[PDB]
């Protein structure tokens, strides 16, 4: 019964998903305010990547894969990813 290992979800760089989606879905999956959203991009492109949320595996796992989704079944290259912290 030992401490919990959780998962970053990270938002990755692209120059292709429009600035304006990459919001709406961050409020969507991640109830992330427009100013905070906008921040995490800028962190993005700075860098490459920038975390999101720290949570549980299962549900960064879940929650990456629908944000991902969201951005894939509308023809963007937009990606969520997650890593062990």
């Given amino acids: 019964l030992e401490r919990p290992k959780l998962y970053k979800v990270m938002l990755l760089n692209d120059d292709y998903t429009p600035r304006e989606f990459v919001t709406v ?4 999956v991640f109830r992330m305010s427009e100013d905070t959203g906008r921040r995490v991009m800028m962190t993005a492109h700075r860098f490459g990547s920038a975390v ?3 949570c549980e595996r299962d549900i960064a796992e879940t929650k990456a894969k629908e944000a991902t989704d969201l951005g894939k079944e509308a023809g963007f290259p937009l990606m969520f990813t997650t890593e062990p912290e």
Avoid: E, G, S
């Fill in 52 to 54: 999101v949320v720290v």
């Fill in 25 to 28: 879905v961050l409020k969507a």
